[PDB]
A = this chain, B = another copy of it.
Amino acid sequence: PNIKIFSGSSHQDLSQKIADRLGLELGKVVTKKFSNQETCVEIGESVRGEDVYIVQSGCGEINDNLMELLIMINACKIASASRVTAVIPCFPYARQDKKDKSRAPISAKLVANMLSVAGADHIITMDLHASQIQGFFDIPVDNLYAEPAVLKWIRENISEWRNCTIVSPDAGGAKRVTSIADRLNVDFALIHKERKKANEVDRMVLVGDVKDRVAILVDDMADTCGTICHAADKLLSAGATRVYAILTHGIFSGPAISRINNACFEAVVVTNTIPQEDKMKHCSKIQVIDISMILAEAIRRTHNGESVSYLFSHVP
């Protein structure tokens, strides 16, 4: 079997980068819409007995892209592909990973079931919002970390990183922030927005010392940037000299760009798990860490039957 890399409509630049790093051309696929807005998928080459990797991030037109991915997976399976792997850099519906409300769906589990029934044999993803999403499948799920790339960026772009403090913008980010602070041998802090019992002012509590130090906000994603912007205001109010925000998934939906442009961030750093070209044109603060080499190495090692553990300590 040979590696066949197919791109959905979501992140075709990332698919191209992965294919170039693998020394391959992208597989021939026409991914369009019928007139009635139904997804049209036209695989333009044989995938018989091939090791098919479909790159599709959960971003942009989320349901459009997920349906595109499912249809492409099913087409490859029925076309007798040896193995179909869904490379989903940003897993859609990952934040709907539990039922903590009455009648609430576990949409991440539904997406996992849909991918399984479409015929996916393997999932490659980066920085799942909850790592337990790996357990939502009965197939192997690669949950790659952007943490080595984040550490590289911090050590190369922040002069006073050895005296910095890594800040969690919410309680759920504590593990990620503590891991990064341990790897950098720096202090960490946590910011919590307390629960909205009524319609008074949202107030943020900070635990840890950030006074007269550079604060690096690290989180898994910035959708509306309410979390990171509120954390940034709190950090400046607490005496932080400079505030950075580093995310792996830059969704930047809704008012995020205006929020960041009016915030105090020295830089907002995201990976290219989601296309950022449009976002960077309206926000100069955004910088992008390319993770295409990580995904390409993961695909290559999956095809060659080699461990991907190397990707959790080094940036290829």
Tell me the A residues contacting B by CB distance below 8 Å: 34-39, 41-49, 59-64, 66-67, 70-72, 74-76, 78-80, 92-93, 96-100, 102-110, 113-114, 116-118, 122, 130-136, 138, 140-141, 143, 168, 171-172, 174-175, 177-179, 181-182, 187-190, 192, 194-195, 197, 205, 207-208, 223-224, 251, 253-254, 302, 305-307, 309
Contacts and interface: CB of A to CB of B under 8 A. Distances in A.
A145 B87 CA distance: 36
B78 A63 contact: no
Given A92-B38, A135-B108, A179-B195, A114 B70 contact: yes
B98 A134 contact: yes
B35 A224 contact: yes
A230 to B, nearest CB: 15
A214 B132 CA distance: 34
**Secondary structure call for the A interface:** mixed
30 contacts: A35-B224, A36-B59, A36-B62, A38-B63, A38-B96, A38-B107, A43-B102, A43-B103, A44-B103, A46-B102, A48-B307, A61-B63, A63-B64, A63-B66, A64-B64, A70-B110, A70-B114, A76-B103, A79-B103, A80-B305, A98-B132, A99-B134, A99-B141, A108-B135, A113-B138, A132-B132, A135-B136, A174-B174, A188-B192, A208-B208
